[PDB]
Amino acid sequence: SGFRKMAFPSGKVEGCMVQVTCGTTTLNGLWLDDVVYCPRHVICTSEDMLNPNYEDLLIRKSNHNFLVQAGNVQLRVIGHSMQNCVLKLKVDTANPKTPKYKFVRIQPGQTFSVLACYNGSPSGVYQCAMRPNFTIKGSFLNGSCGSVGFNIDYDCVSFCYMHHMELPTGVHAGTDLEGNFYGPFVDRQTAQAAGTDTTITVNVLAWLYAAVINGDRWFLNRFTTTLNDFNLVAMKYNYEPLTQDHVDILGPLSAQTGIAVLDMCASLKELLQNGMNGRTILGSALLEDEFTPFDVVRQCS
Amino acid sequence: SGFRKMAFPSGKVEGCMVQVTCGTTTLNGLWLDDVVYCPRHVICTSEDMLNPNYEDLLIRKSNHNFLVQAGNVQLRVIGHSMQNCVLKLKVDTANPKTPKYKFVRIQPGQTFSVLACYNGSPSGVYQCAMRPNFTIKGSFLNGSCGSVGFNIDYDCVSFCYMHHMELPTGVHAGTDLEGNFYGPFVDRQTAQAAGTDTTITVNVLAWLYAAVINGDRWFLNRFTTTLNDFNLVAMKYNYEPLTQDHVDILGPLSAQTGIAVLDMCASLKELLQNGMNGRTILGSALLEDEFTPFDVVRQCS
Numbered sequence A, B: 001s002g003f004r005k006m007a008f009p010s011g012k013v014e015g016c017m018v019q020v021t022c023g024t025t026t027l028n029g030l031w032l033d034d035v036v037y038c039p040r041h042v043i044c045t046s047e048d049m050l051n052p053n054y055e056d057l058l059i060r061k062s063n064h065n066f067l068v069q070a071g072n073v074q075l076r077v078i079g080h081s082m083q084n085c086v087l088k089l090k091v092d093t094a095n096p097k098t099p100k101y102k103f104v105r106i107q108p109g110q111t112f113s114v115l116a117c118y119n120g121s122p123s124g125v126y127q128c129a130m131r132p133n134f135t136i137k138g139s140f141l142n143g144s145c146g147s148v149g150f151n152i153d154y155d156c157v158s159f160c161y162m163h164h165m166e167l168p169t170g171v172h173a174g175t176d177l178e179g180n181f182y183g184p185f186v187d188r189q190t191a192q193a194a195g196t197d198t199t200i201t202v203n204v205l206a207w208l209y210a211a212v213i214n215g216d217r218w219f220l221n222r223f224t225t226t227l228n229d230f231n232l233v234a235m236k237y238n239y240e241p242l243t244q245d246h247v248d249i250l251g252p253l254s255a256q257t258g259i260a261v262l263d264m265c266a267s268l269k270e271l272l273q274n275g276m277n278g279r280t281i282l283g284s285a286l287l288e289d290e291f292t293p294f295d296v297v298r299q300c301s
């Protein structure tokens, strides 16, 4: 029993974290095979950040301008190239701890573990979701750029996020491991603000199914709803629209509990209307939206 | 910025989990050098659990009765003994990934990371606190026994917990790595229950400091109080007494924010008496007590 925000075991990722230094800037790189992946703003000064010309800054760099340190060992950089907003440094040594891995770009609402690191050494691991506004609500201090997010389904690490920056509202923006930002952000010091955040409706529903599975039914009711009537109510609470895709994804959890999806949607509608009236659901006094249907199935009975 | 429930990187502990089977019971073991540590109830059958005589049940066992699996490799048991409620299995192979480590016993209110495992395979990591009633609010399913809790100090893994059982309220109970239970529990199938719990006051105050560091300040006020006055309030709301030692531990946070501990106690007093009036603190509608002062400091530096 119990239900916890659970991250993936981070060991396979720890073995890939290295330190990248350019001039006075130091941040984290991801060492996979003979390539080290890191944010390209490692090559900027603060004066460069307002309008950086990355091709121009990079063409002035030699391989020996990049210091890559893996634990105690210096790695020798033998090549470098830029792909979108990540720098790819070729090193002379393949990472002997390289796991089975792949790069995956994820959709808003998906969750992943974050291995926060500073100076190439891991600091902690925690669970995150990609918000509908393409930010993440993480915990990053200065020096954490290059920290990566990942899932480990079976023995393959699927890398899905690398950290680049904090927006003024305290949320965080990054790229996939091909260097493409999530959302409309740029590796540039401009007036860019995240769109208004919404609640991941499908995840709240999965987490309500999780509450039933662990034996709590107090929030159900005798009512149902059409899909469109549910969405008309949910947008009024800044909930994300629920699509037929989301209805399909919830099917297995519906069958395990015996509660049809739209009946669970009626219960969520009443929770939004009533609040919780002093009770809790899986130990939380708010409706939790950072557990996916997949996450619930992995953790629950 | 940001504040998340954060676990230690679990790699150093992942390399120590093995599968241990005795008959039809299979659970997890902790493999350090040439000894595997696991709960002693692995040797019991279902009817044995009703009233086990572990000394007699172990005399009837011999080395070959213990199948130990380090991934795909079989470890050969060359000896077996008991320390309190954990079974120590001598093996023929020293673990080559044995990290620097200590066995420590933690105090109620202290936090640690749990690496949940099933069949010797790590499946997830999360952060836990030893509750004042000596239980932990974990997330475990059948087969998780032998999962370990740990802190990492510098390079050293401090093992503090081994999972043994779940209680009827869905919370969890276990031993230290020397086999001594946390709390008044026994490794036997009998009627056991968690006692009434209390809130860890020093941890709530630390979390309130974490909220101020992250720009959440609406609960601060002009007032101060005394240890004696506040502890009267603390007793009323089922909060642990705040001691002079707790005020000292909160020293580093009281300076960084320029907010005296008794100054902050006035804020918590008001939150306890009046509630939160629809607002949240670090995204929570209840007062979080599973962050120690150190947890706050380490994450905010």
Ligand SMILES: C[C@H](O)C(=O)Nc1cc(Cl)cc(Cl)c1
Binding pocket: A041, A049, A164, A165, A166, A167, A168, A186, A187, A188, A189, A190, A191, A192
């Ligand atoms: C939110 C603001 O626009 C910002 O944080 N910009 C920035 C982006 C990168 Cl990728 C690196 C640095 Cl140092 C600053």
Ligand SMILES: C[C@H](O)C(=O)Nc1cc(Cl)cc(Cl)c1
Binding pocket: B041, B049, B164, B165, B166, B167, B168, B186, B187, B188, B189, B190, B191, B192, B193
């Ligand atoms: C709460 C109940 O008394 C219980 O969970 N008893 C138990 C203890 C251990 Cl250590 C192992 C098993 Cl299988 C059952």
Ligand code: NA
Binding pocket: A017, A018, A019, A069, A070, A071, A119, A120, A121, A122
């Ligand atoms: Na490193």
Ligand code: NA
Binding pocket: B220, B221, B222, B223, B224, B263, B264, B266, B267
């Ligand atoms: Na005050």
